[PDB]
Ligand binder design. Sequence first.
Ligand SMILES: Cc1c(-c2nc3nccc(-c4ccc5c(c4)CCC[C@@H]5NC(=O)c4nc(C(C)(C)C)no4)c3[nH]2)cnn1C(C)C
Length: 266
Amino acid sequence: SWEIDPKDLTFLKELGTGQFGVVKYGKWRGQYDVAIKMIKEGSMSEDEFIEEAKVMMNLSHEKLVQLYGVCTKQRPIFIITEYMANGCLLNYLREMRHRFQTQQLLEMCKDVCEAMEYLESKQFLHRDLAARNCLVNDQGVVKVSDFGLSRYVLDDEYTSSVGSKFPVRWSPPEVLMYSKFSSKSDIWAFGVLMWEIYSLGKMPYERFTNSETAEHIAQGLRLYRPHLASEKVYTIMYSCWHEKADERPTFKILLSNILDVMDEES
Ligand SMILES: Cc1c(-c2nc3nccc(-c4ccc5c(c4)CCC[C@@H]5NC(=O)c4nc(C(C)(C)C)no4)c3[nH]2)cnn1C(C)C
């Protein structure tokens, strides 16, 4: 059920390179758009991923990038997913030509929140939620990508909290201090993602290094209100950054708050 025949794939364009190597755009059976991760040797705990891929196949939500299957008979292995024509959210936000309205920005937040509420309902952590790990389709809908895959990364620079590739700027204090991941670390990251959306893809804490950011958030420093964010929107993102993890909202509560603000500010 999980296996796709790689001979059914036609490779058309290169999309980029990430933690696991190259990702390509292609067609499945000459017809249907797909994205294809080509997993570089040494980059992934492959047997563990393949077992988990069976669980991931059952995760299905309109705002989650759909896993179609895997190709595991020969190396490199492929991961075949839904193709998102308008690319990575972070780049999309940074293209000033879009001149987003604040209603569109809130809708992007809601798209992600719906995906995350679904994952939370399945007790499934994303673990690296950020604009760089969201994608945009040809209709401008944002979807969440590569949920859970952090577990299978073999690179210590990514995994270690002091590693060069670790997502310090998306991490709550208890992750920076104790590497304590939970639903509530996804909540913190979601707040930073809201901030990224309303900041049109600026780097969080853009004037600090990772090391300085870690020290500052331990001391209680927070991101502050993006120019395009209303007070009501800012209240929602800020609620994600409570020092105490148990005082942070759930994704269901965030979704309810986002919907209320949409109704109030339209
Ligand atoms: C880029 C683009 C698209 C585009 N559509 C797409 N549809 C589906 C998937 C991708 C896709 C997803 C992810 C990645 C890329 C592409 C390329 C960069 C690396 C990135 N990340 C990982 O591969 C990766 N990261 C991880 C972590 C565990 C570290 C989170 N696991 O895998 C799509 N890209 C379309 N246009 N463009 C631009 C105008 C060229």
